[PDB]
Write a protein that binds this DNA or RNA. Sequence first.
DNA 1: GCATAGCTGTCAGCTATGC
DNA 2: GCATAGCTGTCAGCTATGC
Lengths: 216, 217
Amino acid sequence: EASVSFENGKIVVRLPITRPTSKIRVKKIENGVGIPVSTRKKSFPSDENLRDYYIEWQISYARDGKYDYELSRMVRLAHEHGILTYNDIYELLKFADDVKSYLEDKGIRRESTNEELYGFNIYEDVYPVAKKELPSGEFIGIVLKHAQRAVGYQSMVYVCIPLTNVEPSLAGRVARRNEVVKYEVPVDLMKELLKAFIIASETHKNDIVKFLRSII
Amino acid sequence: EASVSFENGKIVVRLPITRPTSKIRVKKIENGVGIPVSTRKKSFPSDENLRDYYIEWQISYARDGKYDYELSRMVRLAHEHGILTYNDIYELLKFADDVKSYLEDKGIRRESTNEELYGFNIYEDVYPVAKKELPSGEFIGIVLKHAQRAVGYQSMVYVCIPLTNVEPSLAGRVARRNEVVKYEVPVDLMKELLKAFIIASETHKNDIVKFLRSIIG
DNA sequence: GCATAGCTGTCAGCTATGC
DNA sequence: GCATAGCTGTCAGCTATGC
Ligand SMILES: Nc1ncnc2[nH]cnc12
Ligand SMILES: Nc1ncnc2[nH]cnc12
């Protein structure tokens, strides 16, 4: 339900904010950890406190093994209009050429504590995270966690967009039935997203490199 | 696909070990955490390293709004056949009455590091875990993680049984097509399992308490 | 014989459905 | 208008289905 278009010299994306179990989830990110939000029941703050509210998007890039879906389309569209240039892609390919390690290589561990809870010993499951933040507010998270349907752990890439960066302003009120917000995607966000996939896993890198070399 | 029966003075559970996406999964311990295992492709060690392979079972207790399913049935049969006494249940109910805090009350946090990865800053997501290990080999884990289909995080209770405690011994070979192992359940495992739910969350406690009370009558 | 479709943890928000 | 059924992140192991 993510619609990517090109309006007024900008790559525009329209995101649904009422599907808490989709790949596009509204979360209140405080203390670093994302917490679910009932957009249809809880009215958003009207203060400057709207900065704590992000849109967690596990962005796609492949469909029918063709690489013309969401991120891949955004990149293609950006390339078509001369926003993303040859040198921009050449940088990314040069960047991927030097990548030897990935987040997926990092391991999950269970650490012990001296705390107890009614006879039970307290431990901590520790999952590795790679994260880059953009000055405009958006940040990109690469999180190692279990696959939703498959077996094992993968690097998950999330694009997190603060609600202060989208329109209309959700401040002071509640999300409407099937409400969709509009978001102008900066080109720098795409490059860092591509970098994020490149360092996520060797498999992701090979896909991105293949895709980028196909449009040079 | 988890059958529970009473045989020869013991509670016996038969577990399928070729469904790695079910609530019964075979995992190999590694740095404290479990790693998935393709039982149909892996020749289990004939060595003494088989004690590092366990059966992760996200055990159930409710169905159709009635508590006669897996764990709940196990408890009923144990009490009916005089393996779980009234004093055992009082001891558990008294224990539940003294619980004011739960694992679900603990918080998830994202810690920072001084480590990087090609410009990206490395962080660590830390989820709380409550664990209890029986001297027999089995251990029980209570893990705060996201719900599979629902929204948000909740306490997950897993029963971890080492393969060295079940029959037959899979040492040396790979698993068979739809192979099922047999495991006799200790009372202490049943008792500590109930405590786990009791401290997992306030909702689980009310379930266990209502269940145990219905048994006495 | 051989390739793969199609199912696959104890659960909550939202809305199309059915009336 | 209202109560609720039934859908719901980018993916792998296993085995019955298809041929
Ligand atoms: N094993 C389990 N883990 C988490 N929640 C549960 N509810 C019932 N059984 C459970
Ligand atoms: N956003 C994403 N996160 C993880 N894996 C992916 N594969 C394709 N898109 C992905």
